[PDB]
Ligand binder design. Structure first.
Ligand SMILES: CCCCCCC/C=C/CCCCCC(=O)OC[C@@H](O)CO
Ligand SMILES: CCCCCCC/C=C\CCCCCC(=O)OC[C@@H](O)CO
Ligand SMILES: CCCCCCC/C=C\CCCCCC(=O)OC[C@@H](O)CO
Ligand SMILES: CCCCCCC/C=C\CCCCCC(=O)OC[C@@H](O)CO
Ligand SMILES: CCCCCCC/C=C\CCCCCC(=O)OC[C@H](O)CO
Ligand SMILES: CCCCCCCCCCCC[N+](C)(C)[O-]
Ligand SMILES: CCCCCCCCCCCC[N+](C)(C)[O-]
Ligand SMILES: CCCCCCCCCCCC[N+](C)(C)[O-]
Ligand SMILES: CCCCCCCCCCCC[N+](C)(C)[O-]
Ligand SMILES: CCCCCCCCCCCC[N+](C)(C)[O-]
Ligand SMILES: CCCCCCCCCCCC[N+](C)(C)[O-]
Ligand SMILES: CCCCCCCCCCCC[N+](C)(C)[O-]
Ligand SMILES: CCCCCCCCCCCC[N+](C)(C)[O-]
Ligand SMILES: [Ca+2]
Length: 425
């Protein structure tokens, strides 16, 4: 029985320009402290949990590798607050959770965030199923009084069902729906940064096959992941006049969304220390008003253990932070690990634009794209970790080289590096 605990973290973030010299800001070389006290109790079928956050930094630096963690120098936050009930069935892996909680999916491409949700979890040796509802109402932070433009009035409903057909081999289907209840800006009106750009309903229907894809300790000399997703729905996009400094609303446009996302990967377990492999991912692009343009839920971190280590790496570069939106990416990787002691991960990515006249999903780059050019760029990552006997010291960095899609006047190279010192009580 463990009731209280505290997580002390010391983050060192260094990021360079983001907009690659096209706008003011995006540069960081700052240090910060993160104290996360957590409470927990359990009474029969019931259990309750709370986690707070206290952050004091030299600037607005990132303190965790989550979607809710993508403002003033210091802030207090209500990280997690939930009540759980495991008395619905006689199943040990079955439980219903209500409140702000972490929604986790192993690929991190669907859900990996702390959000207000009612999530029903069912886990057995043979079958795993999860069904829930989620919506953002507040950031529960002292420095933020307004939600993200995309999170405001966005209601989610998700379902997972997967079976272990062969030992270490899982096949499953996934469903997600995001409904936008928002209000768009009127022609003469002003459109802000925290102001909405789109409305409409989007349904995701995916199929995923795994053979110890995110399991660092496997008997199998080869590991794989294969995921195919079909995005269907409609959208109400606010057109703008970006040329004027204020960027006024003007009109809007409608278009049905019919897109598709694919993600393949192969890992080679050379021995119990050395691992390597290839990855490929494509998010459909083009069509009128982004008709064939794929997009993700908005609850994704795109972080996983695809490299074959305890450490979680960003699937589409730590610096570029790729999203499967009009994006095609080739991936090479290599990892090393000693005992429960150390681990390293070296990853290389080459990015492409599916449609040369439309935008790409980038969670780390804020630069305009050159029309008619598909070469986004190439990235190299390094994740190094030492574990303490229970903290860890970790370097997590990416080095992005902007290609032909980012015209002259943009930086030759950009980075995003982190040094994290955690100590859990
Ligand atoms: C273009 C689509 C063609 C449809 C065929 C799909 C075939 C996909 C194969 C994926 C790699 C092989 C997986 C092998 C595997 O799961 O091991 C079976 C083993 O565990 C049984 O004991
Ligand atoms: C939307 C639901 C939110 C629920 C709030 C989360 C609950 C807050 C803290 C979790 C720890 C349980 C606190 C209850 C308590 O103090 O009972 C005493 C007992 O735990 C002694 O250890
Ligand atoms: C006791 C366990 C609670 C589960 C209750 C069952 C909830 C109903 C359906 C579960 C499917 C997952 C939800 C996803 C969904 O249906 O939305 C997609 C739908 O809008 C397609 O247009
Ligand atoms: C063997 C190479 C492994 C790759 C290491 C990845 C580390 C990523 C970024 C390092 C940040 C420190 C700045 C280093 C530097 O001087 O880069 C110059 C220029 O590219 C700035 O973006
Ligand atoms: C910015 C700090 C983040 C980096 C973590 C520090 C890890 C340092 C070196 C990793 C390379 C592995 C060498 C250590 C090793 O395995 O041999 C020594 C002993 O076996 C363990 O003490
Ligand atoms: C390699 C990644 C490590 C990031 C580097 C962190 C440097 C600490 C910056 C503190 C100095 C900033 N200042 C002047 C505002 O205090
Ligand atoms: C430990 C490093 C944390 C330093 C943050 C303090 C800086 N501050 C708030 C005075 O600007
Ligand atoms: C060197 C700083 C001391 C480390 C302690 C970190 C906790 C900082 C709490 C900040 C909360 C204040 N705030 C933002 C609500 O006004
Ligand atoms: C629909 C999303 C479910 C909301 C459940 C979270 C409860 C958080 C307390 C605020 C009311
Ligand atoms: C360490 C946890 C401390 C408790 C939670 C503090 C967060 C309060 C959120 C309300 C902040 C007020 N505001 C400015 C957003 O309106
Ligand atoms: C990518 C390989 C495709 C394999 C398809 C799965 C066939 C296994 C037969 C289903 C039986 C499932 N089970 C274990 C619940 O009985
Ligand atoms: C593709 C099939 C994936 C769904 C597996 C559910 C198991 C049915 C019993
Ligand atoms: C990034 C490319 C993928 C790495 C491929 C892994 C290399 C295969 C292992 C060759 C080792 C030879 N051996 C021991 C089997 O004889
Ligand atoms: Ca800049």
């Amino acid at each position: 029985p463990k009731n209280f605990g505290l997580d002390v973290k010391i983050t060192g973030e260094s990021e360079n320009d983001r907009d690659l010299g096209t706008a003011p800001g995006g540069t960081l070389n700052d240090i910060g402290i993160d104290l996360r006290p957590w409470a927990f109790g359990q009474w029969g079928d019931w259990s309750a949990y709370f986690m707070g956050q206290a952050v004091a930094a030299t600037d607005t630096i990132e303190t965790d590798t989550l979607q809710s963690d993508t403002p003033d120098k210091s802030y207090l936050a209500a990280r997690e607050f939930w009540v759980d009930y495991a008395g619905l069935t006689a199943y040990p892996g079955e439980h219903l959770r209500f409140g702000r909680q972490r929604l986790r999916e192993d690929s991190g491409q669907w859900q990996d965030t702390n959000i207000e949700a009612l999530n029903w979890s069912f886990e057995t040796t043979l079958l795993n199923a999860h069904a829930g509802v989620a919506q953002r109402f507040s950031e529960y932070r002292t420095d933020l009084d307004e939600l993200a433009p995309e999170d405001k009035d966005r209601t989610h409903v998700f379902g997972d069902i997967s079976t272990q057909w062969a030992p270490h081999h899982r096949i499953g289907v996934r469903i997600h729906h995001a409904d936008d209840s928002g209000h768009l800006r009127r022609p003469g009106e002003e459109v802000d940064n925290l102001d909405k750009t789109y409305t409409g309903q989007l349904t995701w229907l995916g199929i995923e096959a795994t053979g110890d894809a995110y399991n660092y300790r496997s008997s199998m000399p080869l590991n794989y992941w294969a995921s195919a997703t079909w995005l269907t729905g409609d959208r109400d996009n606010l057109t703008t006049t970006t040329v004027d400094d204020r960027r006024i609303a003007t009109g809007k446009q409608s278009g049905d969304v019919n897109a598709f996302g694919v993600d393949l990967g192969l890992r080679w377990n050379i021995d119990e220390q050395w691992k390597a492999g290839v990855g490929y991912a494509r998010g459909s692009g083009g069509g009128k008003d982004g008709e064939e343009q794929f997009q993700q839920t908005g609850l994704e971190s795109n972080r996983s253990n695809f490299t074959g280590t305890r450490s979680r790496v960003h699937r589409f570069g730590e610096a570029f932070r790729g999203e499967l939106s009009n994006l095609q990416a080739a991936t090479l990787f290599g990892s090393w690990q000693l005992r429960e002691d150390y681990d390293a991960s070296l990853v290389y990515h080459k990015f492409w634009r599916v449609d040369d006249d439309s935008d790409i999903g980038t969670s780390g780059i804020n630069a305009a794209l050159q029309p008619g050019e598909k070469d986004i760029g190439q990235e190299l990552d390094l994740v190094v970790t030492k574990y303490f006997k229970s903290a860890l010291i970790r370097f997590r960095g990416g080095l992005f080289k902007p290609g032909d899609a980012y015209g002259p006047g943009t930086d030759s190279t950009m980075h995003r590096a982190f040094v994290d010192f955690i100590w859990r009580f």
